RNA sequence: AAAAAAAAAAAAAA
RNA sequence: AAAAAA
RNA sequence: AAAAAAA
RNA sequence: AAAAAA
């Protein structure tokens, strides 16, 4: 009774990876919610070229993803993850062709094609979403050499524009920057960089994360946050009995409104009413199974700290 | 017994939406502003398609735009406001052409157009304000996510460019900016983010705001600020009797253009940010508010309108 | 026996402005180097069209001001400067024909021409010369709204194209700009926002600002900084006997010498903003001390940490 | 003897400067090698004009430069060196036509024209790379105008466009902010400021810095840092017997490896600058440590926060 | 040169 | 959640 | 100080 | 207030 999203995605990855498909590893997830993604993006060997406006470069590199084979049963894809030969039926039949619209299909009025659209349209949200939690998850333990300062930071994760455009509130990057760093219409979305992403065991099931189940440390950090989060949040997560690397959630941040003051009628802006009258006192917001708690801040990013407490 | 604007927004007003048009709500006003505003900017279905110098995703739309069925009789407009048979004569009748120019008309010397292109332009200023005190009243309960710093908010409100164009004086955006960063010539107008709007009840029967008038406050918050100013500006209200909803104006705010307090680097010196605050805590500023009895200055409170009104509130 | 460059410009002004041209009031010098310099740019009414790339506006800008009726005698340049009749015969004389390039008139050999392109380029420089200094003037006591950050405050003063083409030295504006944000080559010259220039009256008949000659506050303050910059500067002037609005200068600023103090991240250190300030940690700078050139000698002047601006208005009563 | 880049450079070097060219002298072989430079890259006064997208202005540029005579044999370059009269047969055999991309010789198939092109590339970045560390050099002692501020400075050197293009790991300027600012593929390089560029006279001798050498204490400097590093790096220099000049080498610094120091604002929280320098307030950023790598073994030095261009004109005092 | 992330080369190159 | 869309 | 040289 | 004008 899972949702048509969930439901979509399911289908595809079973179809396309056979039973090596393991849907209870985040690492084999994303690697398949990857590789679907590259799929329908038509990015794979053999599939058709982004030649409407493309330049001498990548009009080369484009006629040579063409030209070379397309992948073959039984190719390892990630560590656990083995083609099977109904990828290649499912890639031709449920893949849109290269430049559909959901436009021209709609007024066309096939059931069919607009049911495959909106399957597409839901497959790629979903890898989308797998893949910004699974960027946040290797964030953790390694950084981006990109990331040298805040403004820098501001703008995780790093993704492509597909990426973007599938799910414009939680991917960062370019394509996030110059939307910011350029005209908004109404239609514009500001990136989300703490948004609430389950763990991709949990988000294909429909399962909502929340108190009570079990998780990982790292698990939780990248579902609530990504590396350069300050560490307080890792009070969200309680070790179990004997630890083990699995413990379970004992609460979720909470985050909404402004205290800027604009400059009027002679007066001087200011950047936030409560700071005139203490930085390393600021406290979080925790959402816990009696209330909600605040939490002095740490001080330290999340990737700090783990690499401090690993030994 | 009213001014040429306020007349033929009126009628312009009327003969579109029949008497489903409430002049009592600031609301429906609003939503016949922006409506009105989309038919003599072209922006609606069926409407004559902009490709002068349109690129080609432009044309596209443009020709998707045209293409697309025009509003039919009967549509329902935002909430309680629903169009009536004979709007599409006003729009074929008092809607100049795509690309009219008032230099042409006069060079026509057509009386008629010249009073058409006259009203047009008239519309055009006074939907563009109520839109601006619209937005302005928006921000007030709504933040705008395209804000985020200081200088985010100085170009509010953001609108089109044809907004700029009307009321270049009170409506900011992304062409203000531009305005803004090039030269400033004669005819150029500052963006001011707080001139005061009469509410659009008030503006389309031009009894201008002042002291006693009963208004709301967030609605007379809008007409004299917006979200993220100073919530000082409250003291310009007061409840009437029996608190309710609606109170009463009991001040004006003014602004006497601050003074510069900036001392550029020079013979080896050190630039500095602010005179006064070098001597960083002031709150000692001061707001003039013109009441009956004179002039007072309302110490500033230092936090938002937006916050102050939901914790008001609790 | 003043310099040429001078000399063209008293002659000038004389031509084209009768004896209505006072070469003792500075606001009246201001307005007749603001006209001459219009005049020698080809801005005035009938005069040529700019119309080698010109866009459509500004086609029919300059084909309005060519048609447009050309300034006659007896017209009124501000409020102390009348035309005569012999400005036509000047302005045809002297003015260098639109487009006229120096290369050009060098390479035909003609000696008058090439005088009188010598005599225009002298005439330019002194004109953007006075108006600069009649900028720094204004700028006393009504800032620029296009000025409220440092960042905008670097390019005063905001002068035209040909202005910042004529006397890149002491120049701003966007064209100012321009050429800092970009690159530099063997010809580039700094803006020097402070650059000390002699107030008009005392640049059209060649003397130099020095120590002990009368001149009115502002004037003086005009000469050596503009509004925004530190009140400390006031210090270089007294007031004399009796006041009445004129003193004398005691002094004038000793302009620091070009010394960076940064020092950028490397093999993992962290970058510093200011040497000096880094190491204590003293951030106050309402300690650093102005240079100025006494009678007797060199003094160091604590700064007031209030600009020019507010301290005049604050002083005015 | 040689890799391929040394050999081509020292062949055509003396080619072009006969004997003129002193191979132990630093201002020598950066004067020549900016010559080739100049003579590879078309700039030379009587070569081919660039106008495929040039614009108007750059059209005229380079027609004037074409129909400018081209230097003559005997010309003096730099200050000790002198063309000689087979400079023209070098330029017209060995520099590639104007436009030449490797892809089309690779299509043509001819050998010695491949090996020719490789010699252009190799002569180009090995020019490059002189440029880079002379312009360093000049750092040491000339403070660049354009260094105003560290933003100013994190762009070091200024350098053409050409020289991005052939070695883009090293030359800042224009193109590599234009490169940085844009999108970052695969290829792109991030502007190395502090490599370890051996000193002209060990470059193109192939002759690899290292610990033991004797260098001038300038040279060095500007071999791993540049004017506005901090001074801490001068201590990887040491005085030989007898003072003089020339000393040694006694470390080479290293690249601290990366671990960032911030913490981004988030769930209410506020973005921290540094969490180190937060503590309690206390910004006292000298306690910074440059790893320099010496013959006994690794070692940690005390920063100096003081400008290298500062510390080595007060220690000559 | 810390079963799987600097230096030099070859494919790319205002 | 439905709609729209390099 | 000599040379060069626009929305 | 008026006159210009994507």
């Not at 990828?87 to 849109?96: D, K, Q």
């Not at 239609?187 to 960089?193: R, S, T, V």
């Amino acid at each position: 009774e899972l949702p048509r999203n969930l439901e979509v995605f399911n289908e595809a990855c079973g179809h396309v990876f056979g039973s090596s498909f393991n849907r209870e590893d985040n690492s084999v997830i994303s690697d398949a919610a990857a590789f679907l993604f590259k799929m329908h993006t038509h990015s794979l060997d053999g599939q058709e070229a982004k030649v409407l406006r493309a330049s001498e470069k990548k009009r080369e590199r484009e006629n040579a993803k063409k030209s070379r084979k397309a992948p073959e049963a039984g190719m390892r894809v990630g560590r656990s993850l083995i083609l099977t030969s109904r990828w290649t039926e499912y890639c031709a039949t449920c893949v849109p062709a290269l430049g559909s619209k959901m436009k021209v299909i709609k007024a066309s009025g096939d059931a069919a094609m607009i049911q495959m659209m909106k399957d597409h349209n839901s497959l790629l949200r979903v890898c989308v979403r797998i893949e910004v939690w699974k960027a946040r998850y290797v964030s953790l333990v390694a950084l981006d050499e990109r990331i040298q300062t805040l403004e820098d930071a501001q703008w995780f994760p790093y993704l492509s524009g597909d990426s973007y455009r599938a799910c414009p509130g939680l991917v960062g990057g370019y394509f996030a920057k110059k939307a910011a760093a350029g005209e908004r219409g109404k239609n514009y979305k500001k990136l989300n960089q703490t948004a609430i992403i389950p763990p991709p065991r949990f988000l294909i099931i429909g399962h909502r994360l929340q108190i009570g189940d079990q998780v990982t440390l790292r698990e939780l950090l990248a579902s609530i946050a990504w590396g350069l989060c300050d560490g307080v949040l890792a009070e969200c997560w309680s070790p179990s009995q004997g630890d083990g690397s699995i413990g379970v959630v004992v609460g979720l941040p909470l985050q909404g409104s402004c205290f800027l003051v604009v400059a009027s009628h002679g007066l001087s802006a200011i950047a936030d009413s409560r700071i005139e009258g203490n930085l390393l006192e600021e406290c979080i917001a925790i959402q816990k199974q009696d209330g909600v708690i605040k939490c002095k801040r740490s001080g330290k990013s999340l990737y700090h700290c783990l690499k401090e407490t690993a030994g």
